[PDB]
């Protein structure tokens, strides 16, 4: 992924 | 620095084969005391172009640009710090600041308004000057965060688990799963062990460490 959750 | 002794303590944990000798007794090694004062919240990798941005625990943000500079918002949403690839500092606001700075303070205000209106806070139930990331990197299953603190960071991307490791309290805090946020002592999870899964996670940290120690500048 390209951010966190 | 303070990698060399994360090494050293998770050496010892992972030398001591905590999941693989009788009876476990991992709750023990719970130490509140040792309780992190900083971890990432929030991160959004923007990496390709401008860098890193992320939230700490205490609602700050911060973002590491891809060329070594930081820049850091102190949660009072004004008070900024600069940082240069040599970890020179200078201290500024946001409704003050040079104008060669522009640009970087646009880039910071957007992370901080993405991280307020989005995402989940990790440790979010959970209550030393500020620190900054001085490195990170990520692999296929994880992204590794390091701060200036001399605190590493873990996330495993898969099943959103995670490390916050201390060289200072020489603890690690594993956040499991369901969000349960545990701290322990690195020595007493020699002492009393651990399960199978925390064990393969502290193992993974060693090599990311080391991935760290061996990359440095």
């Known amino acids: ?5 | 620095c303070h990698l060399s002794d994360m090494l050293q303590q998770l050496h010892s944990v992972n030398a001591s084969k905590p999941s693989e000798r009788g009876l476990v007794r991992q709750e023990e090694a719970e130490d509140p005391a040792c309780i992190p004062i900083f971890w990432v919240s929030k991160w959004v990798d923007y990496s390709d172009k401008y860098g890193l941005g992320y939230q700490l625990c205490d609602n700050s943000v911060g973002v590491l640009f891809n060329d070594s500079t930081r820049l850091i918002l102190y949660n009072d949403g004004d008070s900024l710090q600069y940082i240069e690839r040599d970890g020179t500092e200078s201290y500024l606001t946001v409704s003050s600041h040079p104008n060669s700075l522009m640009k970087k303070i646009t880039l910071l205000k957007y992370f901080r308004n993405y991280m307020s209106e989005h995402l989940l806070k990790a440790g979010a139930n959970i209550t030393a000057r500020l620190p900054y990331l001085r490195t990170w990197f990520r692999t296929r299953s994880a992204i590794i965060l390091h701060l200036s603190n001399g605190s590493v960071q873990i996330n495993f991307f898969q099943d959103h688990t995670k490390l916050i490791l201390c060289p200072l309290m020489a603890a690690v805090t594993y956040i499991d799963e369901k969000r349960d946020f545990r701290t322990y002592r690195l020595s007493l999870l020699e002492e009393y062990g651990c399960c199978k899964e925390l064990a393969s996670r502290l193992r993974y940290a060693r090599t990311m460490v080391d991935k760290l120690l061996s990359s440095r500048s």
């Open chain 1, 1 to 5: 992924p390209l951010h966190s959750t």
